[PDB]
Design a binder for this molecule. Structure first.
Ligand code: HEM
Ligand code: HEM
Ligand code: HEM
Ligand code: HEM
Ligand SMILES: OC1(c2cc(Cl)cc3[nH]ncc23)CCCCC1
Ligand SMILES: OC1(c2cc(Cl)cc3[nH]ncc23)CCCCC1
Ligand SMILES: OC1(c2cc(Cl)cc3[nH]ncc23)CCCCC1
Ligand SMILES: OC1(c2cc(Cl)cc3[nH]ncc23)CCCCC1
Ligand SMILES: N[C@@H](Cc1c[nH]c2ccccc12)C(=O)O
Ligand SMILES: N[C@@H](Cc1c[nH]c2ccccc12)C(=O)O
Ligand SMILES: N[C@@H](Cc1c[nH]c2ccccc12)C(=O)O
Lengths: 322, 309, 323, 290
């Protein structure tokens, strides 16, 4: 068995066809444009392989066995490490001037980054909302990616099964509501001296944000608008994991929720470096840099609710005692 | 024209075949081992594409027109930026455990990184000391390496002519002078030998005979002229050039060094040969790195008069 | 010596956990402090390069071309430092939101707006005060150090005083400006007769034509200048293009490198701003966070002008051939 | 309470005194040499802070309460992330040339990196084989070190109990030499290995059964510790490369610090040379891993 055939280099190293050269005008730099894209595409392929396997571990019910938690977390972690490398690859393409790009730009229409299947599958499989062309079996794979359970949904189901939520067990939700309410009364009774009412106003801010956690109708309204993604119950699971992270059963789960936020951030870091590049090369649906600039928002953060949990931080003493 | 077709994705994204799976025991991590390789190989091809283009500009006489020096330097820079990323790219494969590698290791046999054609071309084309692919490989040994092209170009540096600036004559004079000026006998007597030893062609012509040096003597003087008068406008960009060349060398060693760590993390203690590639033995531009041990006080540097610009 | 040379008796006695001095030591506060100290140590150094580069422009002896190697290589060093500053945020990412919240209270009134060095850094590069987005909605001899910094010459101002004097712009010399507008007309007229031989590139042509010729609109330039969009004088804009188009010309090689650095700085600063705000979001949720997302706009890019050059890329065979 | 006060910047940003002004002529590039050094020393301090508190959780015995494993692994990992930055950090000082260095090198002598307290503190607390700086050096030579603490912990690893799970046992060609306990203690007597015989099998158990819930975060601690070792080496190698970029060849000793002899956690490294087919690993029964 030969290194070359094992790696299928007869394919990989035979895939660089310069359009400029095909049209009787080799432009040196077009070869960088191709290589850079094909390397990202191999890594998208690998992200999909990691990400699909973790999806099966939840689909399966195999996550129901903690033994498998180390597999899920270190493949999530592996996605991050790849995504990080992806962000740093931009540095290679910055060694291309706009003037070198402008010599070959024309040979490129009407191709677009939107024709990237794997990028779309990736967004879909993670759980990018969809309300926010392709043919044949590519179009199949895409519909499978829009219809199969997403990593977001699979995680939401696992969150919804967190130990601690049982109102006849630990009763987390119920005591958290009770301790926050007692907490605030304490803070109100204290605050009674009189130009520090900065403190009264800062109190009234704290109270609105903390007691809003307990407003399920609010959350539903927010879900149907798209501004939150996890079901209310999922949210109670994720807070339980955050608040009781040191407990052994919650340690590796807490790492997972941390990875999920890493992947999201890093997806954003990607998008933001794509937008800076576009701006370097070209200046200023699609408008068309303006559509991209648009994708750098929280609207593309699949794990938005995990980030926002940090808004419902409380003094340590108010956390129900386990 | 479609993204996927333009990038020949029907080849790139159809090249992953898990030997373990083919052999009826699919192991998850093998896919990472293939992709990582395949991505290193893409960039080797890029590095080779930049290198050959640069090689050609020397071989071509195009370097003689200073208009071209920016294309040389910016391409060389680019190779170094790739290599930097190639170095960072090991961190992906470190997410694979010895224990996991072990599960598909056996299916790899007897394949070897020695059978990477491109890595080997790379070394040859820079300069470092099987079917039809032999054609490419033999070609890359016969043909002028980057070391040689840079050497030719160094030999022709402005400022060495004995009836022009006479740089080497003036350097020697200033050096034997500075020395007897102040003149712990062991501090002086053992900074003497290395300094004036810059002028004994003989230790030079000798060291070139046991691989210790690579550039020729005139090549040396050129490099030093550039080193010393780097600020004079016509030396600006060529100084950058020598910097990139050194950068290429370092980072090539960095790659070799991290591959060595990988091997150790997977296989423990082939391996012992790889460690020896982390040597100066594999530094194509040793002579340029050592053009720092010949730092002198700025007073001893021969003064520019109304030269050329 | 090593110790005293580095003033380590000072560097390594600057760590005071405000939490601990309230009898409630929070392990993580110490990381929060060290991380800032290292950023500020590197601001001091960006300021040393930047000020020295500022000085080579001021000392007159920039138009002695022998110094360009200095200007350019210290600018590149600014760049490598900020690259490291961007990677440095990953250290502080290992601190969780829960743990930040066990020390955060001991921090008020302190605010990071009170980084002298960061305000100095923005100012010497040339971000302007009328350019700033107000927080909500608005010192000492530190005001006197800062006070100079906005009134003195900004790196932008000083680079612009170098671009004005770019060779090839004398109307009786090479006349780059003149020759450029004349050649575009003819490429455009030639192209117009090409298309006339749906598509629906009649639309595409007209958009190309308006964009290109508005470069020669000195009026429309000063409209956008006096507003805030553009930052360089029409004549500085003119020499920068010279350098872009003729950059292979020996005397323009290193200057084009200059122009590349200045763009890297603004890119790298924005990247810094953007990581600092990613960091606010994970510690604080989703307000200071609003204003920060505001600084990551192009309003804060001091060399927005050079980036904009890319829209006024023309076909190669239209750049005035030079004898 | 104010930013600069809180950060003690009047002290931090007033340590920059270059021996170029105070001897003749301000050479610009010395400023970088000092700030790089100062930044490494700040991170060294931070590394000492995390590394000390991890030590303390082991001495305390707080480690036996598994609640705290997250805090241990997470702080070891932060050490890693810090070390990775300190490796990327050399990239700043490679923007100074040999030539500009030589112009101020004269005036540094005879300061030495051998004189860095924190470096030697950090090397000793991890457990790598003078003014009252030496009261702090001495404790660090005698205070129980992260390698020992971990060894202590490794001794108590479940599934070792000679009548319990009795992991040592076995099959049925470099693997039988794991079982020569004299041969092993003779390596340790020379110091080509560092953990005690029992501590050795704590680790192989954690290795071989890493999936088992109570072993997961411990498998991360071991992985983390290897990492800190690789990162320290890689720092040494980059530090050696600097030296050669500046002073050229003919230094010979620093090469020798880039060896295995300076891997504190060599045992961990080679405990993944012991690699058997999955079919051979001993099976599992009633599990005391919650
Ligand atoms: C010269 C460098 C590049 C330029 C000027 C550039 C330009 C653009 C532009 C203008 C768009 C907007 C969509 C459109 O109008 O077609 C876009 C989208 C895209 N580009 Fe690039 N691009 C570059 C490099 C890359 C690279 C290296 C990748 C990596 C695979 C990439 C992947 C994409 C993807 C996936 C999209 C669609 C993304 C989305 O939905 O947000 N591009 N690109
Ligand atoms: C999975 C971890 C890896 C292990 C255990 C490993 C192991 C080895 C070993 C033992 C050798 C030398 C002897 C031989 O080939 O039989 C070698 C050589 C080589 N490997 Fe790897 N390797 C790994 C990953 C990589 C990667 C990612 C690349 C990137 C292309 C690579 C490229 C090479 C090359 C080019 C050679 C020949 C290099 C030379 O002559 O210095 N290997 N590998
Ligand atoms: C725990 C991590 C951090 C948090 C939560 C944080 C928080 C904030 C917030 C909320 C602001 C907005 C203004 C305000 O309300 O005070 C701000 C501004 C600032 N922060 Fe941070 N910060 C963090 C880390 C850093 C770091 C590591 C630095 C590095 C020196 C830094 C330097 C600054 C500076 C200079 C500003 C002013 C920036 C501007 O005016 O746009 N911060 N910070
Ligand atoms: C121009 C760059 C530098 C050069 C030429 C250099 C040179 C050296 C040399 C020659 C030695 C060994 C002999 C001796 O100290 O007399 C050494 C040791 C050392 N240097 Fe540096 N150094 C540089 C930068 C740095 C930096 C940035 C640090 C980080 C704090 C540093 C920290 C050390 C330490 C901690 C040691 C002793 C540790 C050991 O035995 O491995 N040096 N240096
Ligand atoms: O032709 C473009 C392109 C072409 C190809 Cl093949 C891949 C791309 N990734 N991102 C952009 C892109 C580059 C110019 C802007 C429109 C799309
Ligand atoms: O089979 C090995 C190998 C196989 C292949 Cl396909 C590529 C490789 N790069 N580096 C090593 C290497 C990996 C295990 C050690 C023997 C060589
Ligand atoms: O107290 C804050 C702060 C305090 C200090 Cl000391 C440094 C800071 N950098 N960025 C923010 C920041 C941190 C939380 C929000 C208000 C400002
Ligand atoms: O003065 C020297 C030095 C001085 C100082 Cl201050 C810090 C150093 N780190 N590494 C080396 C070193 C630099 C040259 C080699 C001897 C020590
Ligand atoms: N893995 C188990 C238990 C579980 C669910 N969610 C969790 C969250 C944290 C800890 C454990 C769990 C399950 O799938 O039902
Ligand atoms: N470019 C000219 C002059 C030259 C040769 N070597 C150089 C080195 C540095 C500067 C110029 C040169 C040539 O190739 O003959
Ligand atoms: N925490 C317990 C049990 C223990 C020791 N080492 C371990 C390794 C893995 C799992 C548990 C342990 C103790 O320190 O005695």
């Amino acid at each position: 068995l030969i290194y070359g055939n094992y790696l299928h280099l007869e394919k990989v190293l035979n895939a660089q066809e310069l359009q400029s050269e095909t049209k009787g005008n080799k432009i040196h730099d077009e070869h960088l444009f191709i290589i850079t894209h094909q390397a990202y595409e191999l890594w998208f392929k690998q992200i999909l392989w990691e990400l699909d396997s973790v999806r099966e571990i939840f689909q399966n019910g195999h996550v129901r066995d903690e033994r498998n938690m180390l597999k899920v977390v270190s493949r999530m972690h592996r996605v991050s490490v790849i995504l990080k490398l992806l962000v740093q690859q931009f540095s290679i393409l910055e060694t291309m001037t706009a003037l070198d790009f402008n010599d070959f730009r024309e040979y490129l229409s009407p191709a677009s980054g939107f024709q990237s299947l794997q990028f779309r599958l990736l967004e879909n499989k993670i759980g990018v909302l969809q309300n926010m062309n392709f043919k044949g079996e590519e179009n199949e794979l895409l519909l499978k990616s829009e219809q199969e359970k997403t990593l977001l949904e699979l995680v939401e189901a696992w969150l919804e099964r967190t130990p601690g939520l049982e109102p006849h067990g630990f009763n987390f939700w119920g005591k958290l509501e009770k301790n926050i309410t007692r907490g605030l009364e304490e803070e109100f009774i204290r605050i009674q001296a009189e130009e520090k009412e900065e403190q009264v106003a800062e109190f009234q801010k704290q109270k609105e944000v903390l007691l809003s956690l307990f407003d399920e109708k609010r959350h539903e309204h927010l879900l149907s608008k798209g501004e939150r993604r996890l079901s209310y119950r999922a949210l109670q699971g994720a807070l339980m994991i955050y608040f009781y992270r040191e407990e052994p059963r919650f340690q590796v789960p807490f790492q997972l929720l941390t990875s999920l936020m890493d992947i999201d951030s890093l997806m954003t870091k990607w998008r933001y470096n794509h937008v800076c590049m576009v701006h370097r090369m070209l200046g200023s649906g699609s408008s068309g840099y303006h559509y991209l600039r648009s994708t750098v928002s929280d609207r593309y953060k699949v794990f938005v609710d995990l980030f926002n949990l940090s808004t419902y931080l409380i003094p340590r003493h108010w956390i129900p005692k386990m």
